Amino acid sequence: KRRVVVTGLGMLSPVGNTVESTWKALLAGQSGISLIDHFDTSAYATKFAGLVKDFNCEDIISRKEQRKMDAFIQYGIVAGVQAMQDSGLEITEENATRIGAAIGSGIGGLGLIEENHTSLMNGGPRKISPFFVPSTIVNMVAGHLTIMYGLRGPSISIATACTSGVHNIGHAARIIAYGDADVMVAGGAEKASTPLGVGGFGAARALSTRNDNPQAASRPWDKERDGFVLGDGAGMLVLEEYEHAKKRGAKIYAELVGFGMSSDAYHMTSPPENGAGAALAMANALRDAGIEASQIGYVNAHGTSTPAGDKAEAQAVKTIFGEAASRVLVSSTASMTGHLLGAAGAVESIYSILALRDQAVPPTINLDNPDEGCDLDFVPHEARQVSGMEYTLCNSFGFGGTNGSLIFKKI
């Protein structure tokens, strides 16, 4: 009966380009939302995003090599090395076969897609780069990594939009537990801060528009919210079976103990006023982890700062916790970071992990005037210290009404 644990973290976010820095900034209640300058946003209703500041990979990827890879791919490779080094794991011939990857993304190479398409409009097919396909496709983060580290184990890539980070990790854990693998680098990476990304989500009227105050735009559960805030980043984890980890004295951040999935079966982009699906997903994980809602100390909300989004989730929480509704801590890091799409559930799994380590809980900044019936403790404004928190649960929900929840446990 294989127990899956976390032995390495790696991350690039709108508030730090390392695990420890992003964590520091998050507790400090720092925002990473800035105005876009890599493209002309004049015609854009939204002109800011949670961006990755001063990203450098020269030490990890030759410029010769970068040309074959969209930023989302670069981001994820960098965050994977971070995780691989941190794990300490050493790949051997008697090894590779048993180490794999489960990394995804919501869209992938949107930028190079725009680039190549543009090229094709101006110059014709001859202009499309020969690396177009392998530079934009979603599974290339895992493709490059497995190659870089000579990994021969199971490699998959889940693309479930906003839920991708949660799924990739959950299924990484599954794969190991099944016996198909002993280690798995898992998570998600996105960099959709483009014309098509900004323009697209803005076409659906899903994005916030507070351009006069980018850092205040993302306000989960607050009364004046007006749609999520797009963020770039990548969050990777090294999951591994308990024994295999011990036998090598790996530093163990925590143990993955539960994984729940569900479908809303309602709208293609809208959550039921109910939160019915989100509930089922949390519910399924509690049962998988074989524990009770009363046991969760901190929930990492999907809480993207869309009017319906946030109401629905809160509903679900009540439903799931009921009594413990108020005793439980719910917070949205998206308040500082924005929503990282495919990377979202991965970075937030890392938050949930660190929150157990440090017995501290990142705040929901910008929460000035919460909604009405709210009975919940959204850790508004400032970080929170905790005593005996043994479990944290992390939620993510995406389009197609696809939800997933992960439960982390101390030591």
Ligand X SMILES: *C(=O)CCCCCCCCCCC
Site for a copy of itself contains 1 (CB under 8 A): no
Distance CA 408, CA 351 (A): 10
Contacts (CB under 8 A) with a copy of itself, residues 159-188: 159-161, 167, 171, 174, 178, 180
Residue numbers in the known binding site are 269, 302, 306-308, 339
Q: What is the DSSP string of 309-326?
A: HHHHHHHHHHHHHTTTTT
Q: Which residue's CB is nearer to a copy of itself, number 138 or number 217?
A: 138
N-to-C CA span, the chain: 18
From 162, 278, 291, 347, residue interacting with ligand X (rule: CB under 6 A): 162
Name the token pair of 390. 């043994």
Residue with structure tokens 């720092």?
30
Q: Of these residues, 57, 162, 167, 394, which one is catalytic? A: 162
Could you tell me which residues come within 8 angstroms of residue 391 by beta carbon, excluding any fewer than 6 positions away? Answer: 257, 289, 291, 295, 296, 297, 356, 407, 408, 409, 410
Q: Does 107 bind ligand X (CB under 6 A)?
A: yes
Fill in the amino acid letter for 28. Answer: A
Q: Is 203 a binder of a copy of itself (CB under 8 A)? A: yes
Minimum separation from the CB atom of position 175 to a copy of itself (A): 8
**Which of these is catalytic: 144, 171, 244, 302?**
302
Question: Which phi and psi (to 5°) does residue 237 adopt?
Answer: -135, 155
Q: Are 178 and 411 in contact (CB under 8 A)?
A: no
Between residues 131 and 149, which has the closer beta carbon with respect to ligand X? 131
> Any catalytic annotation for residue 381?
no
Question: How far is residue 146's CA from residue 137's CA, in Å, rounded to a whole number?
Answer: 15
144 is catalytic: no
Which runs of consecutive H residues, i.e. helices, occur in 330-393? 334-337, 341-357
Q: Of the two residues 168 and 218, which places its CB atom closer to a copy of itself in the complex? A: 168
* Using rule CB under 6 A, residue 346 touches ligand X: no
Among 20, 35, 85, 147, binds a copy of itself (CB under 8 A): 147
Which one of ligand X, a copy of itself, none is in contact with 265 (Cβ closer than 5 to 8 A by kind)?
A: a copy of itself
What tokens appear for 254 in the block?
Answer: 């925590």
Stretch that binds a copy of itself, among 51-59, 75-83, 143-151, 182-190 (CB under 8 A): 143-151
Among 106, 272, 303, 404, binds ligand X (CB under 6 A): 106
C-beta closer to a copy of itself: residue 124 or 388: 124
**Is 137 a residue that touches a copy of itself (CB under 8 A)?**
yes
Q: How far is the CB of 71 from ligand X (least distance, A)?
A: 13
Cβ burial, residue 215 (10 Å; 0-12/13-18/19+): middle
Site residues for ligand X, 108-127, by CB under 6 A, read: 110
Of how many residues is the chain composed? Answer: 411
Burial of 98 (0-12, 13-18, 19+ CB in 10 A): buried
Residue 96 vs residues 86, 89, 100, 139, 155: alpha-carbon distances, Å = 18, 11, 8, 19, 12
204 binds, among a copy of itself, ligand X, none (CB under 5 to 8 A by kind): a copy of itself
* Least CB distance to ligand X at residue 246 (A): 38
Residues numbered 272 to 331 that lie near a copy of itself (CB under 8 A) are 277, 280, 284, 288
One residue of 192, 217, 343, 346 binding ligand X per CB under 6 A: 192
Q: Are 142 and 187 in contact (CB under 8 A)?
A: no
Q: Of the listed pieces 94-102, 133-141, 247-255, 286-294, which binds ligand X according to CB under 6 A?
A: 133-141
Q: What is the distance between the alpha carbons of residues 375 and 377, in angstroms, rounded to a whole number?
A: 7
Binding of residue 2 to a copy of itself (CB under 8 A):
no
Which of ligand X, a copy of itself, none has residue 152 at its interface (CB below 5 to 8 Å by kind)? a copy of itself
Distance from C-alpha of 180 to C-alpha of 60, rounded to nearest angstrom: 29
Is 162 catalytic? The answer is: yes
Between 28 and 308, CB nearer to ligand X: 308
Contacts of 399 (CB under 8 A, 6+ apart): 161, 162, 268, 269
- Active-site residues: which are they? 162, 302, 339
Q: Which residues contribute to the site for ligand X (CB under 6 A)?
A: 106-107, 110, 133, 136-137, 161-162, 192, 196-197, 200, 341, 398-399
